[PDB]
Amino acid sequence: MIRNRLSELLSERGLKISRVAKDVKIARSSLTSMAQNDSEMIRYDAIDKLCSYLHISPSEFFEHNPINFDFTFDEEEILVDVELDNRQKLNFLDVSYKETSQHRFIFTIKNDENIGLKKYVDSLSAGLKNLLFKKINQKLSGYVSEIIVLHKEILQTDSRLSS
Amino acid sequence: MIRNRLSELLSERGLKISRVAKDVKIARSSLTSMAQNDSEMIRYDAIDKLCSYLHISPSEFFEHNPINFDFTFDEEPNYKINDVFEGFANITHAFSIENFDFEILVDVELDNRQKLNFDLDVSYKETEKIHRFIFTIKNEDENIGLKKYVDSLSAGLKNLLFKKINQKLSGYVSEIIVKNIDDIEETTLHKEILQTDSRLSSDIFKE
Amino acid sequence: MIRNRLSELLSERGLKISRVAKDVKIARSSLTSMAQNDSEMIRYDAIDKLCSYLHISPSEFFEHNPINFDFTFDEEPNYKINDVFEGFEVTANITHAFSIENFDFEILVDVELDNRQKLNFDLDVSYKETEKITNSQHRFIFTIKNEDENIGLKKYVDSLSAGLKNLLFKKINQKLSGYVSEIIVKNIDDIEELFPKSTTLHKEILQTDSRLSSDIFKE
Amino acid sequence: MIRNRLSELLSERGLKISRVAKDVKIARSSLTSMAQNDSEMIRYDAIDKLCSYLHISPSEFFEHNPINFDFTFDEEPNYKINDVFEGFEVTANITHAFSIENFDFEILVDVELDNRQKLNFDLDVSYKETEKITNSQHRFIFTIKNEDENIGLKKYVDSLSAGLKNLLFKKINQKLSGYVSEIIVKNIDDIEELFPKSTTLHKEILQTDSRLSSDIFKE
Amino acid sequence: MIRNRLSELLSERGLKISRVAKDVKIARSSLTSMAQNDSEMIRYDAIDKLCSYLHISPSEFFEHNPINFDFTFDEEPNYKINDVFEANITHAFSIENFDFEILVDVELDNRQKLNFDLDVSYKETRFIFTIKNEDNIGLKKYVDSLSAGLKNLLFKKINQKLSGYVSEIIVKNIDIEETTLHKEILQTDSRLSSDIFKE
Amino acid sequence: MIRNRLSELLSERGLKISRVAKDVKIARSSLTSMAQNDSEMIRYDAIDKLCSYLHISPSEFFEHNPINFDFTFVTANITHAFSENFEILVDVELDNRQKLNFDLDSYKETEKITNSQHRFIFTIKNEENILKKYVDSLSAGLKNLLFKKINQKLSGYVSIIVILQTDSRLSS
Amino acid sequence: FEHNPINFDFTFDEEPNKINDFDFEILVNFDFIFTIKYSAGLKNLFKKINQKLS
Amino acid sequence: LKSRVKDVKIALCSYLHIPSE
User: Fold this and answer.
1) Beta strands in D83-201 (DSSP E)
2) Which domains can be identified in chain A, with CATH numbers?
3) 50-109 in chain A: CB under 8 A from chain B
């Protein structure tokens, strides 16, 4: 669980993406992608150029939490595996379709044994939780569209969870 | 100036590339390079995995100093190459250089926007055999300000800077040399020139 | 900023363009271009002849202010274009061919002083209305949407003289004209008139020019 | 006469051509051409950048003198050329290909002062010998015949400064070399060597440059 | 400014082009053309025969004055022509406004050269033009100095050149055949009427 | 008999043909031809520009005399090419209409000062010493012009032979 | 056979060295005849390592 | 324990503490 903090810092200091790109000589698209926790790799040069410009040590740019989450699906259930440190691996479910520019199916988990999992999710900070929420949805949405298969409308459609 | 400070941590811990490779499912080949500070891009999954396995925080997996050094090489160098047919593996048998002088422009940007500027001049000295071309700066008294800035850095950053500048110097010399030398069939002469490297020795960059 | 004070000198001394063009042996077209500041490169011989004929040292021929403004426009703007079918073919009129709903983009200005320090101001521009200068030509009129936070730019601009401010005002408008026209031409294709010397919509929209009225930038 | 004083300023301030080119974002070739006076047309942006970077007004960037010299070469000279045979092919030594017996031409100099009145001085030049200063490149030497009846021209030239005098000398020699090389190449055809990178006689003679050495036109 | 004085001499003597053409054996057309000061070249042979026949010195034959007038016409004129679709030139084309600048460069006996500038505007219809600024009085003071004959020659030169600039512009801008319109305008002339060049 | 005194004026004032041509904007060849009394027709513009430049009235430019004269008729070496042995009817029409008539009648010898120029000396047989008094009164320039004209015309007639470069001399 | 409450994980290096016309790292958490607490029936796992080297 | 019994690393005796059955 790791995330950038560029989005916030930029909001706090009042600077807009446009100036940041011109001053640090980095393409707008890459800088925009790096601020939403989308890119998978962060070029070292980018970290040094930004840290120098925003006058911040790399302590602020990166936010880390040792707790990790593992998700597993079959080819036929969201098998989350809270994996805290000390190799204290744990296991936690069943979700079923409930109801249906933005088409969104609201699948809903329906199961008094999630009390430990809910406590674990509550501990994560706002940004990491938002990353976790985006990650769980992205994974399921990728898998769900496979069942439906010109314009590939299903690809644009995503899934949703609630609990 | 940013480095990854992986090797240091691993040594004090007492582990080895081999163990970590499996303990955290990271290709042995990649985990090797990322330890020599010589990989352009680092992924996030690596950061979290390594930070957790060694119970550390990102703050100590990175070292950052505001000063940045940029190196622009000369476009018109004064060089004489004397094709020697006798002898050709030796390199000295294939070609020797009477002279080779070019100008290095170094720009040092401090924390404050202030952009101090320094100028350097380099000259061919001799050919040692570890072969390795050796180049030495001419003026180190009119340009001592650069030396003060280089020493203010830590050991790792200085080592990285030295690795970078030496590689860049090797690039200009090897590329310029390959253009005015006739290739001879054997590991051809051109291939031997490419593998060759050059080192700059001075008080300003002692290590 | 630098300019050729040829026009002011010619106006003051009372000479006309033809008399000078014939006497110093420089071609009229080139001389009348150098009267304005459209020309990019000037020849040494022209400077020598014009300085000798008018009894002036090169100090009075050039006026230089150390300040230097830079202009860069937003790469990804917001534009809304509605196709209008009101019989453009019969009469070549801008309003008939199309209408503009909303046009928003960012203009970043980077005032650089004589000192090595560099300031930074931002400007937001919006479309207001199209106007009729001649019954054959029109000029779109935009307006800056933030003047309470950019009083500095007004303070620095007013430090210039009349000619250099005229030169700057021409530069910003000319750059705005090309950028706005390029977006419209890329978005909408061309239509030719029914009765032809025939002029298409692309050429007509390329010839037209924009303007950026604002309390800060005038004259 | 007018010249750009970039070289003297760069020498005085201690800066070097490489540093200036990187700082003002101008290609080194153009800047080193502008260091001399070979360039004919210069850009406004170059003037602004170089004046801003060096903290100088344009009054110091240009030096101007109202005087103006115009040289018109004769259209009918007397050329005496012998096609000496000495195996030029073995070694490209110009003197082997040919020798000059007697080359005489008339140079008409008009000196236009700041006042509308103008004077007129006439000069006669003759061939003498070949300097052979460099084994690869030889320079022809010509001397002004009448110096006693043209003393007035010397008085006027000495009123100019060092740089403008240098510029004047560069012009008379460059034009004299073009007039001579053109005449010589018109008289004799070309011969090429078998063993090269091969250079013909035409190309070698065009490369060869002359020089007019006399007290009036010193330095 | 140089003119031949043959026409004045023949009238005072009492002869006529017809008589001389036979006495000096010179073609009648050539002799009568050389009599109107409008031939570009005079042959050496002609001077000796005529000088001997009239018992006159060459100095009497030629009249010379140092002042030289050079006229340069504008290259960008304000021409506005109203086309009429109903030969009489007044029916083909009618001129609204035709304004251009004439630059005059009087060269005195001394090397010093004075400069005067004149503006010319269309008045009515021989397309008669007139000069806007007559005060530019320095040019007039000099025209008066020229003798009676030389002044007439200068007036003829300006009138012919004016026709050149005008006719060309009009014919090169307006289209017709019924001696067509084009063959009429080129023949049409023009005259600059004002006190400065009064004849 | 009419000639222009440009050459004498240029020699007297010290000016050279090169400078005069540039100042008066007249081609060098035309001015050179005019300065040696060769061209047949001349322009008014040249007369005015030259007179103003030299500050001279046309009186000095032209020299005229009413007396007129009328005439009526193995190797590349010219001498070896051909190989044994005409009368000239001259008049002296005076200004008073007192026309007079003179008769002069063969090849005497050939003299070539140089290989480049061959001259045939057609000395006159002296068939009227009164003609000679008339030629004497003339000035130097007009007499030289008369010599040049008669030599040119008679040489042209003799080059009968058809070689062209060679010129015939009628001397006495 | 005998239920074993212990299983072993062995992994050699992927880059061994020596030839003429051999030191490697075995991963088990602990770390020509090549030399260097957990019934003798099963112990005879030893058999698997034998085939591993050759 | 069902897909859930992954921990076996197979697309038991020491895993569920059961030759036994």
Assistant:
1) 99-112, 121-130, 140-144
2) 2-64 (1.10.260.40), 83-160 (no CATH)
3) 51-52, 55, 57-59, 62, 64, 66, 68, 85
